[PDB]
PDB file of C-alpha atoms in Angstrom:
ATOM      1  CA  UNK A   1     -56.813   6.460  28.253  1.00 18.08           C
ATOM      2  CA  UNK A   2     -56.383   5.743  24.569  1.00 17.73           C
ATOM      3  CA  UNK A   3     -56.648   8.718  21.992  1.00 19.53           C
ATOM      4  CA  UNK A   4     -59.808  10.041  23.770  1.00 15.84           C
ATOM      5  CA  UNK A   5     -58.810  13.621  23.436  1.00 15.36           C
ATOM      6  CA  UNK A   6     -58.489  14.762  19.816  1.00 14.17           C
ATOM      7  CA  UNK A   7     -62.003  16.295  19.194  1.00 15.13           C
ATOM      8  CA  UNK A   8     -61.936  15.051  15.568  1.00 13.47           C
ATOM      9  CA  UNK A   9     -58.244  16.075  14.860  1.00 13.43           C
ATOM     10  CA  UNK A  10     -56.039  14.913  11.806  1.00 13.41           C
ATOM     11  CA  UNK A  11     -52.293  14.343  11.287  1.00 13.60           C
ATOM     12  CA  UNK A  12     -50.294  16.535   8.783  1.00 13.90           C
ATOM     13  CA  UNK A  13     -48.135  13.597   8.244  1.00 13.76           C
ATOM     14  CA  UNK A  14     -44.289  13.375   8.990  1.00 12.12           C
ATOM     15  CA  UNK A  15     -42.957  16.898   8.544  1.00 12.39           C
ATOM     16  CA  UNK A  16     -39.842  19.064   9.570  1.00 13.36           C
ATOM     17  CA  UNK A  17     -38.103  17.634  12.636  1.00 16.08           C
ATOM     18  CA  UNK A  18     -38.108  20.614  14.946  1.00 17.41           C
ATOM     19  CA  UNK A  19     -35.087  20.869  17.033  1.00 18.47           C
ATOM     20  CA  UNK A  20     -34.310  23.457  19.832  1.00 19.83           C
ATOM     21  CA  UNK A  21     -30.986  24.436  21.173  1.00 20.36           C
ATOM     22  CA  UNK A  22     -32.459  26.662  23.993  1.00 21.03           C
ATOM     23  CA  UNK A  23     -29.170  28.781  24.073  1.00 21.15           C
ATOM     24  CA  UNK A  24     -28.002  26.412  26.930  1.00 22.58           C
ATOM     25  CA  UNK A  25     -25.134  23.879  27.195  1.00 22.74           C
ATOM     26  CA  UNK A  26     -26.993  21.288  29.162  1.00 21.96           C
ATOM     27  CA  UNK A  27     -30.599  21.743  27.990  1.00 22.88           C
ATOM     28  CA  UNK A  28     -28.983  21.711  24.379  1.00 20.80           C
ATOM     29  CA  UNK A  29     -26.984  18.495  24.808  1.00 22.63           C
ATOM     30  CA  UNK A  30     -30.020  16.840  26.671  1.00 24.12           C
ATOM     31  CA  UNK A  31     -32.511  17.746  23.885  1.00 24.92           C
ATOM     32  CA  UNK A  32     -30.165  16.502  21.066  1.00 27.00           C
ATOM     33  CA  UNK A  33     -29.383  13.257  22.839  1.00 28.68           C
ATOM     34  CA  UNK A  34     -33.205  12.551  23.296  1.00 28.93           C
ATOM     35  CA  UNK A  35     -34.980  14.365  20.577  1.00 27.74           C
ATOM     36  CA  UNK A  36     -36.044  11.183  18.673  1.00 26.93           C
ATOM     37  CA  UNK A  37     -38.365  10.332  21.487  1.00 27.93           C
ATOM     38  CA  UNK A  38     -40.815  13.113  20.707  1.00 29.13           C
ATOM     39  CA  UNK A  39     -43.158  12.558  17.815  1.00 30.29           C
ATOM     40  CA  UNK A  40     -42.460  14.048  14.356  1.00 26.56           C
ATOM     41  CA  UNK A  41     -46.155  14.613  14.166  1.00 25.70           C
ATOM     42  CA  UNK A  42     -49.125  16.499  15.807  1.00 30.49           C
ATOM     43  CA  UNK A  43     -52.976  16.216  15.899  1.00 31.08           C
ATOM     44  CA  UNK A  44     -54.944  19.277  14.832  1.00 32.13           C
ATOM     45  CA  UNK A  45     -58.406  20.622  13.752  1.00 35.30           C
ATOM     46  CA  UNK A  46     -59.349  22.377  10.409  1.00 31.79           C
ATOM     47  CA  UNK A  47     -58.372  25.947  10.912  1.00 31.74           C
ATOM     48  CA  UNK A  48     -61.741  27.069   9.357  1.00 33.10           C
ATOM     49  CA  UNK A  49     -63.521  26.397  12.700  1.00 31.38           C
ATOM     50  CA  UNK A  50     -61.184  29.162  14.195  1.00 32.13           C
ATOM     51  CA  UNK A  51     -59.093  31.279  12.015  1.00 31.53           C
ATOM     52  CA  UNK A  52     -56.449  31.934  14.671  1.00 29.07           C
ATOM     53  CA  UNK A  53     -53.147  30.508  15.731  1.00 29.07           C
ATOM     54  CA  UNK A  54     -53.947  30.153  19.449  1.00 27.06           C
ATOM     55  CA  UNK A  55     -57.345  28.368  18.688  1.00 28.09           C
ATOM     56  CA  UNK A  56     -55.321  25.916  16.498  1.00 30.42           C
ATOM     57  CA  UNK A  57     -52.109  25.441  18.613  1.00 32.84           C
ATOM     58  CA  UNK A  58     -53.689  25.410  22.102  1.00 34.85           C
ATOM     59  CA  UNK A  59     -54.979  21.930  23.116  1.00 31.22           C
ATOM     60  CA  UNK A  60     -53.558  20.673  19.926  1.00 30.52           C
ATOM     61  CA  UNK A  61     -50.213  20.780  21.890  1.00 31.99           C
ATOM     62  CA  UNK A  62     -51.854  19.254  25.008  1.00 32.90           C
ATOM     63  CA  UNK A  63     -53.615  16.337  23.054  1.00 33.09           C
ATOM     64  CA  UNK A  64     -50.566  15.271  21.176  1.00 36.84           C
ATOM     65  CA  UNK A  65     -48.523  15.676  24.337  1.00 38.41           C
ATOM     66  CA  UNK A  66     -50.923  13.652  26.378  1.00 36.20           C
ATOM     67  CA  UNK A  67     -50.908  10.894  23.639  1.00 35.43           C
ATOM     68  CA  UNK A  68     -47.100  10.558  23.681  1.00 38.17           C
ATOM     69  CA  UNK A  69     -47.298  11.005  27.572  1.00 38.95           C
ATOM     70  CA  UNK A  70     -50.208   8.623  28.467  1.00 39.07           C
ATOM     71  CA  UNK A  71     -51.189   6.512  25.386  1.00 40.79           C
ATOM     72  CA  UNK A  72     -47.410   5.620  24.965  1.00 37.64           C
ATOM     73  CA  UNK A  73     -46.729   5.576  28.840  1.00 39.27           C
ATOM     74  CA  UNK A  74     -48.593   2.189  28.585  1.00 40.08           C
ATOM     75  CA  UNK A  75     -45.099   0.816  27.116  1.00 41.06           C
ATOM     76  CA  UNK A  76     -43.510   2.545  30.225  1.00 40.35           C
ATOM     77  CA  UNK A  77     -42.763   5.664  28.078  1.00 38.38           C
ATOM     78  CA  UNK A  78     -41.807   7.886  31.064  1.00 38.60           C
ATOM     79  CA  UNK A  79     -41.100  11.487  30.019  1.00 42.27           C
ATOM     80  CA  UNK A  80     -39.776  13.286  33.151  1.00 44.69           C
ATOM     81  CA  UNK A  81     -40.393  17.014  33.715  1.00 43.99           C
ATOM     82  CA  UNK A  82     -37.014  17.768  31.888  1.00 46.34           C
ATOM     83  CA  UNK A  83     -38.611  16.048  28.972  1.00 45.63           C
ATOM     84  CA  UNK A  84     -42.006  17.703  29.006  1.00 44.29           C
ATOM     85  CA  UNK A  85     -40.617  21.091  29.280  1.00 46.01           C
ATOM     86  CA  UNK A  86     -38.787  20.454  25.983  1.00 45.63           C
ATOM     87  CA  UNK A  87     -41.532  18.686  24.155  1.00 46.65           C
ATOM     88  CA  UNK A  88     -43.988  21.482  25.105  1.00 46.24           C
ATOM     89  CA  UNK A  89     -42.086  23.289  22.235  1.00 48.38           C
ATOM     90  CA  UNK A  90     -41.510  20.315  19.951  1.00 48.92           C
ATOM     91  CA  UNK A  91     -45.089  19.707  19.490  1.00 49.03           C
ATOM     92  CA  UNK A  92     -45.822  23.618  19.362  1.00 48.43           C
ATOM     93  CA  UNK A  93     -43.254  23.761  16.335  1.00 47.75           C
ATOM     94  CA  UNK A  94     -44.819  21.214  13.892  1.00 49.61           C
ATOM     95  CA  UNK A  95     -48.227  22.766  14.865  1.00 50.99           C
ATOM     96  CA  UNK A  96     -47.076  26.361  14.412  1.00 49.90           C
ATOM     97  CA  UNK A  97     -45.740  25.080  11.064  1.00 44.52           C
ATOM     98  CA  UNK A  98     -48.754  22.946   9.994  1.00 42.23           C
ATOM     99  CA  UNK A  99     -50.878  25.957  10.970  1.00 42.87           C
ATOM    100  CA  UNK A 100     -49.006  28.367   8.577  1.00 41.67           C
ATOM    101  CA  UNK A 101     -49.406  25.876   5.604  1.00 41.24           C
ATOM    102  CA  UNK A 102     -53.034  25.083   6.447  1.00 40.57           C
ATOM    103  CA  UNK A 103     -53.597  28.868   6.754  1.00 38.57           C
ATOM    104  CA  UNK A 104     -53.391  29.225   2.959  1.00 38.85           C
ATOM    105  CA  UNK A 105     -55.195  25.779   2.672  1.00 37.16           C
ATOM    106  CA  UNK A 106     -58.469  26.840   4.432  1.00 35.69           C
ATOM    107  CA  UNK A 107     -58.201  30.469   3.145  1.00 39.88           C
ATOM    108  CA  UNK A 108     -56.622  30.047  -0.384  1.00 38.60           C
ATOM    109  CA  UNK A 109     -57.276  33.930  -0.453  1.00 40.95           C
ATOM    110  CA  UNK A 110     -60.589  32.652  -1.806  1.00 41.83           C
ATOM    111  CA  UNK A 111     -62.904  34.847   0.566  1.00 44.68           C
ATOM    112  CA  UNK A 112     -61.201  38.165   0.084  1.00 46.05           C
ATOM    113  CA  UNK A 113     -58.513  38.280  -2.676  1.00 45.92           C
TER     114      UNK A 113
END
């Protein structure tokens, strides 16, 4: 499997580093000690096809995940559960964010006011 997933997606290009403290001690330290492995980018489709967050953030998360979980696992890149369960939010953050910005890109108010 190589990048056979993104249905014609794009990359918003290197953005905010999300970081997540979980309110834990151990999940917090774990995350901070490892957060560089998770990409600083996510693959998304033009919001215009949708107009929602879920329909933009859904398999966007899965696709990018599965890229850094399979397309990179080729170099032995082995994210455990205690990794996936963290990056499940990491990829969500930048997409939630890229979505909000893109939300005025596709719209520009330009269809209402």
